[PDB]
Design an enzyme around this catalytic site. Structure first.
Site, mmCIF file in Angstrom:
data_model
loop_
_atom_site.group_PDB
_atom_site.id
_atom_site.type_symbol
_atom_site.label_atom_id
_atom_site.label_comp_id
_atom_site.label_asym_id
_atom_site.label_seq_id
_atom_site.Cartn_x
_atom_site.Cartn_y
_atom_site.Cartn_z
ATOM 1 N N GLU A 1 25.084 -13.168 20.964
ATOM 2 C CA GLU A 1 25.240 -13.798 22.271
ATOM 3 C C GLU A 1 23.882 -14.079 22.908
ATOM 4 O OE1 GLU A 1 24.932 -12.822 25.665
ATOM 5 O OE2 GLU A 1 26.087 -14.508 26.469
ATOM 6 N N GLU B 1 0.850 -1.184 0.000
ATOM 7 C CA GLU B 1 0.000 0.000 0.000
ATOM 8 C C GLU B 1 0.890 1.239 0.000
ATOM 9 O OE1 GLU B 1 -1.145 2.203 2.923
ATOM 10 O OE2 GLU B 1 -2.352 3.291 1.445
#
EC number: 3.6.5.-
Lengths: 444, 55, 450, 439, 297, 51, 55
Positions: free
Chosen positions: D253, D70
């Site tokens: 991590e 859109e």
């Protein structure tokens, strides 16, 4: 340095040629007394384009108004600018006009148009620099169309490799009460497709329609309508009339307007609706000048912006204002409708601005632009030619001195092969998204 | 056995027109839509002739 | 160094007279007829006083042959604002105008004066022994356009040998001009002017229009302001042979370090530390933002992303007027970080060229007392988007077939257009495919092109 | 420490530009281009102000991808509070959108736009080599939503090897929703984009509704409030990468710390010390109530009982900004005495992480000056009911074969819906087989 | 960005469309002159959805309307905004209607519907893009049912990926010029149930029933009848023409409302039943004036 | 001939495996069914598309 | 075709079982519908042999 001179061919052509050269000379002023009238000497070569020097600083045309019925030439020639010519012209004979195409094209050769080739051999030789000559070709009758196409066929052999100015006049069947219009006009434009360079097919039919149905004119004579077409052709000729920042020769513009040189049919309009007849004196400033540029009212054809695929548009703005807002509105008109989106030569516009006014209304404009709604005009003329061809209709005196069925059959076959190719080019969207590569590459 | 059925599906391939450069930009979209609709039906018929003949 | 200057077309003659009168005000050539500084007639005989030497009549006239079949441009160079400071008798007019049609010049309308321009170049080519090449002011389609440059280049490559052919191939803006057919001559340019040349440049018109309408804010969107700024760029490039001294970084190593390849033939230009006449009120003289706005699209002639165009060469050029030690002082300003994406087989460093003698300022324009400049001119693969734009224009026009019958009944051929398309494709693929880092030829097994 | 984020869907672009505006306001990245703290234009790349790239002559841009079919959403973004420094060359949008479904945007009309954004992803992937996953913003039915993601996750996991990534799934709320078939697109998204994923966490708009109307006493359920709250939460999440402190560990991590299994994949983002102009005025901030108010049911993105919610992991994130001294005091004041009901046969080690260098709070919003952050990224094996309720509603609406006809002629078959039901039933029954505590 | 066409039909559909755009331009006020009366200058897109571009900020509908009885449209062209229409709607003749379903369905309409499909085809592309079709269609006349059914069929083989908005007046035993209308109904929605996307059971004798009994109105005329139905469908389509934050799009309305795609006959009601005549003039609060939302009578 | 023999030979080379276990491998077995039937149909349409 | 035109007729004659049921809404309303889909493909190739007998 440059010349384009005057010659005429047409029953409705002599009047409009005289008035058109008046309205291109109405703000320049070359008098027949024998002395110069210098008010602005920046149009020396510009008036030398049409009025060539033959005496002491006197610039005269080479106007050869040729009529086989010279009563119009006898009557209208004694104007203010109508006597400042080289007097060895207007070669004429009274063998007859008769509104007939065949005897005008066939038997009247050595009578008058041989003197016409001789006199244009002489008058294109004793001058500076030729680039062609001008003529207001009219299809009002048969003799004028025949002599115009005779002149075109003879000047494609006189100076073959030269762009020469060719016009046409679309007749008005509402006004032209002749019982047979479409023979000479259709076969003439058939010849002119493969015999010319450009056609500015100005008309008397749709302009009659708009002056009787929109302008509300109670007196639609040839005078004020000739003033209308003269203002339109003045806006056309502003490219060569005025010395701008480019001073564009029409030799370049003839190659500019053709995408392929077979097809050279488009007509101008007049965007700000000049007031010949119903009058107004308002200054047509920029937003009302451009608001009427995409109209389905003023354009001198069967108006259809929906049936419009325009190729090259150009409007000369000799009104003294900058072109930034004009180009912004040009972009707005360019992108607000999808009918104009064809995307060949993606800079297919022109904005030429001069400072020399045409008339007392100082800031105004016009419309010239490529015409694509002419397919219905060609059909409206061609199928009513074939309406009065199927029963061998109107062979009363179109049984000419040399008559064949092959000429008419090939005329209608090439008419079909131009309208069908035109409708094939109005369709088959081979640049926007009509290829096979907009949706990936592989779709079997 | 189905070597004529694969010629029938090659005729369904042969029912494909060209994507029509002489075709309006609204209309060859319709050609593409009826294409994908008909090969949706062809894929249904293909898994029909695959599953049914295997028994 | 006494290179022959050819100027054809309306833009070529226009900027030729403009730039040579800029040399006249630069070298002091007063409208009297001779300089008041050095009393040698016409011109001097120094190392930099070498453009003006003895060919005409003992007066060392400015050296430029001005030919164009459009007669009005020859008239306004004959009847402009200087009447005797150019060649007093060597400018020959043209008789019939091409009138914005290129294809007439190469085959029909310009063939009568090819013998005359050959006589002129034989006159001006048997001159003094210094001749490093040709200062060609190329145009596409304005006057004759690419016609005389094309025939001169082809007969100069097959008749004069292998001399360098330095071009200023202007790619003008379609907004300010009036022609539409221009992609056809701009793509025949590759066939008739690119292979038989040896070195080239680029000047543009879109960025000057963009800054004049939006940034520089000068109400002059015509060829005049374009001439006013291209005169500055032509004076800047000719200052190498015009300002001789300790740092005379001249054309000799310039032509070496511009072009690496046959079809890496097209450099780029990024000169825009400009200060306007409406900015000419003692504003900031900057040596920092002219370094900080280099790869921004303001200085670029064509709007291209530097994020995608790898560079096989980079020629830095900072022409100032203040100190020769400011060369080192500006070396130690911004050059240390410069993490710029490069081809994995090209050098990294930046050359330096300065002209520390101050120049003479052009009056009556849109420029202040300009003294310092930045230009990061190089051969970039980021012009592939511009040539793809030109090829998109030509593909759309060839699908539209505009003026094809205009451009075939004079000597051209559809197979000739096919070969021009292949030449344009070669110039594309030496910048599109080969021009990018081609490291994918070492070896791997995934199913690639072995 | 470099990553480039993509955003799809209307609400995806909304949370994307809200969060990027918060980023640029809290690093001092001004609309003048440069950050005025130093003399580098556009932005920077030093250790943690590393959301940029040297595009121009030192010019740096806030690298992100904003994609929606859109077209007006990027226009209303570009006229916002961060106006002109979004990219003028990669804001790629379509012409007509899929208009609130799945199948058309995925299979039929997006098939000529997937390769264009793929080429854009390749052009931005020719840039700087820092890569620590991705950050994909999407919803279930907001804009295109599932239609782009269901194809592009497969395309990323096939075309770009086996590279890690991360995605944002906006869990819907039927009280402020705009569709009815949300069980279908939810079940389809959950069998597709989660099995081809590396990390994800679902944020519930109904949870925002609960913590606003039931915990903050405000009376405005507008997507601007949701955008600002998502900007705050994702800014607190990204602040580990964005600012360096004591335990400035990377997002790689985190994703190599969290996920135990391809199926056991989702956390319960626990951050509700709810604040506004009301609940920030003259209060006192302490490390007891904000940490004791975590396990309770009215603090969660997805609803769960505390005793019935079993924590496979109890990872934590702190914005710190004062000391690590009080955090390592609260590790005994709160974290050590935690005998709360846990999962059997798994380690019971609580994790904390503090990241200094304060991200600046939202300017012009509603909340006043606040200090602490308790973004405790736990996980819960009893979120199987949070999708089993949708599977139950999908059973009660799917036996009627409702809205099937819109999802037949676009390539799929009823076997796809049976496979989606099978996949969610497999995930749930795997949680009551081995996820919920077993023998 | 978002465009909707203007195709109308029938002898009653045309007049209810005239009242429709009258009452939905009542809050817009778009003048037919050219003085550029802007309703809201931020709503250029939401005037462009219905009133499409013809000039510089002169926004007119995709005005094409067809019937063979020109007296009704020549009467309604002299309305408040009855002249802001393009000179392309006048595609018609004088063959007559006669309440003949066959001539609109089969015989007479087959030689005139080609011009209507040609003009909507050449008008559909003259914008940014196409999104929606709409139609005020009736069954009280004879020709209208047939040519509306054939137009829906032709737009099915010509524009499949486009929604169409099909208002449909149901027959009436209470007001009826002729009574053959069961045949005008049983072979009209025979294929309309598998040809269009969404439909309306706006009734006529339940509509006259609520006009007469439960309102006590002394106006059993088409005037106040068209006023009421135009106000009701204006309140319906206000959502589609004014997308504030919600009120989902064209296929999106078909996605969340249509299971078993034949069962697409939703019934448009309205709560307060305000009518020209007996009027109630208090500020309509939510609860005690939205209590007329759930009552099925 | 040999093409349809190949296609039906691959069809009978996809047997339904035994249902046994605590429903881990059954979803992979369904995936194997649907995928391998898809590319055997792909090979079929390619072979009969060249011919 | 013209002798293989009846070979697709014996293909429809060969592999068309009675619609044996399997569950509600299935195998007597939708497998019957895919059989009528096959019949409408037959109808389409009938109007397409209408135009190959033209040539």
């Amino acid at each position: 340095m440059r010349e384009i001179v005057h010659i005429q061919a047409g029953q409705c052509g002599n009047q409009i040629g005289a008035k058109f050269w008046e309205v291109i000379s109405d703000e320049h002023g070359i008098d027949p007394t024998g002395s110069y009238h210098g008010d602005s000497d920046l149009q020396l070569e510009r008036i030398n384009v049409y009025y060539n020097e033959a005496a002491g600083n006197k610039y005269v045309p080479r106007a050869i108004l040729v009529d086989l019925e010279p009563g119009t030439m006898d009557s209208v020639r004694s104007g203010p600018f109508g006597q400042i010519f080289r007097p060895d012209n207007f070669v004429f004979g009274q063998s007859g006009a008769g509104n007939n195409w065949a005897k005008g094209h066939y038997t009247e050769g050595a009578e008058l148009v041989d003197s016409v080739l001789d006199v244009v051999r002489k008058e294109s030789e004793s001058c500076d620099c030729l680039q062609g000559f001008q003529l207001t070709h009219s299809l009002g009758g048969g003799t004028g169309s025949g002599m115009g196409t005779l002149l075109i066929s003879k000047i494609r052999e006189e100076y073959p490799d030269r762009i020469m100015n060719t016009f046409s006049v679309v007749p008005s069947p509402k006004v032209s009460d002749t019982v047979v219009e479409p023979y000479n006009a259709t076969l003439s434009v058939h010849q002119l497709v493969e015999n010319t360079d450009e056609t500015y097919c100005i008309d008397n039919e749709a302009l009659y329609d708009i002056c009787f149905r929109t302008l509300k004119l109670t007196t639609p004579t040839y005078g004020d309508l000739n003033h209308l077409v003269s203002a339109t052709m003045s806006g056309v000729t502003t490219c060569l009339r005025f010395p701008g920042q480019l001073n564009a020769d029409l030799r370049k513009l003839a190659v500019n307007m053709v995408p392929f040189p077979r097809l050279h049919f488009f007509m101008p309009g007049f965007a700000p609706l000049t007031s010949r007849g119903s009058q107004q004196y308002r200054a047509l400033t920029v937003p009302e000048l451009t608001q009427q540029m995409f109209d389905a009212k003023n354009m001198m054809a069967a108006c259809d912006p929906r049936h419009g695929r325009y190729l090259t548009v150009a409007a000369v703005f000799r009104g003294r204002m900058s072109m930034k807002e004009v180009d912004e509105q040009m972009l707005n008109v360019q992108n607000k409708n999808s009918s104009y989106f064809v995307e060949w030569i993606p800079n297919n516009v022109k904005t030429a601005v001069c400072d020399i006014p045409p008339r007392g209304l100082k800031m105004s404009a016009t419309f010239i632009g490529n015409s694509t709604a002419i397919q219905e005009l060609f059909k409206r003329i061609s199928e009513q030619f074939t309406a009065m061809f199927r029963r061998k209709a109107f062979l009363h005196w179109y049984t000419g001195e040399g008559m064949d069925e092959m000429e008419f059959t090939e005329a209608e076959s090439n008419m079909n092969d131009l309208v069908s190719e035109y409708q094939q080019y109005q369709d088959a969207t081979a640049d926007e998204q009509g290829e096979f590569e907009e949706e990936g590459e592989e779709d079997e | 056995d189905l070597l004529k059925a694969v010629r029938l599906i090659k005729f369904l391939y042969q029912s494909n027109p060209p994507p029509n450069p002489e075709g309006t930009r609204q209309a060859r979209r319709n050609r593409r839509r009826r294409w994908r609709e008909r090969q949706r039906q062809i894929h249904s018929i293909s898994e029909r002739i695959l599953s049914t003949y295997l028994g | 160094r006494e290179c022959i200057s050819i100027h054809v077309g309306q833009a070529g003659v226009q900027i030729g007279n403009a730039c040579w009168e800029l040399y006249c005000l630069e070298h002091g050539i007063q409208p009297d007829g001779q300089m008041p500084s050095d009393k040698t007639i016409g011109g001097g005989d120094d190392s930099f006083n070498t453009f003006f030497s003895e060919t005409g009549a003992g007066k060392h006239v400015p050296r430029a042959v001005f030919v164009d079949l459009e007669p009005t441009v020859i008239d306004e160079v004959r009847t402009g604002t200087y009447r005797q400071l150019f060649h007093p008798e060597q400018l020959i007019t043209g008789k019939e105008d091409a009138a914005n049609n290129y294809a007439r010049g190469h085959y029909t309308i310009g063939k009568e004066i090819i013998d005359l321009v050959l006589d002129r170049i034989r006159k001006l080519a048997d001159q003094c022994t210094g001749l490093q090449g040709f200062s060609v002011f190329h145009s596409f389609g304005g006057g004759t356009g690419s016609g005389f440059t094309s025939l001169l280049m082809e007969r100069l490559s097959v008749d004069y040998g292998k001399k360098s052919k330095l071009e200023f191939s202007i790619y003008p803006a379609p907004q300010v001009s009036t022609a539409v057919v221009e992609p056809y001559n701009s793509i025949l340019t590759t066939h008739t002017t690119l292979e038989h040349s040896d070195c080239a440049f680029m000047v543009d018109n879109e960025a000057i229009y963009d800054i004049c309408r939006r940034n520089l804010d000068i109400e002059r969107p015509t060829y005049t302001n374009l001439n006013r700024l291209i005169g500055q760029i032509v004076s800047s490039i000719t200052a190498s042979l015009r300002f001789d001294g300790a740092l005379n970084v001249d054309l000799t190593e310039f032509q070496t370090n511009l072009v690496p390849y046959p079809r890496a033939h097209f450099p780029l230009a990024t000169y825009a530390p400009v200060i306007s006449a409406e900015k000419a009120y003692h504003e900031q003289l900057s040596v920092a933002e002219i370094t900080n706005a280099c790869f921004e699209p303001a200085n670029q002639m064509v709007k291209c992303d530097p994020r995608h165009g790898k560079y096989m060469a980079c020629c830095l050029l900072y022409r100032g007027d203040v100190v020769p030690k400011d060369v080192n002082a500006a070396i130690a300003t911004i050059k240390t970080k410069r993490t710029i994406q490069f081809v994995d087989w090209c050098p990294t460093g930046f050359k330096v060229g300065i002209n520390y003698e101050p120049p003479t300022v052009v009056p009556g324009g849109d420029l202040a007392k300009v003294q310092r400049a930045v230009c990061m001119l190089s051969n970039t693969t980021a012009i592939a988007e511009a040539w793809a734009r030109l090829d998109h224009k030509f593909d759309l026009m060839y699908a539209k077939r505009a003026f094809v019958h205009w451009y075939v009944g004079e000597g051209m051929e559809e197979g000739e257009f096919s070969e021009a398309r292949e030449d344009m494709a070669a110039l594309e693929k030496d910048y599109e495919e080969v021009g990018v880092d081609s490291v994918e030829g070492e070896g791997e097994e995934e199913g690639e092109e072995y």
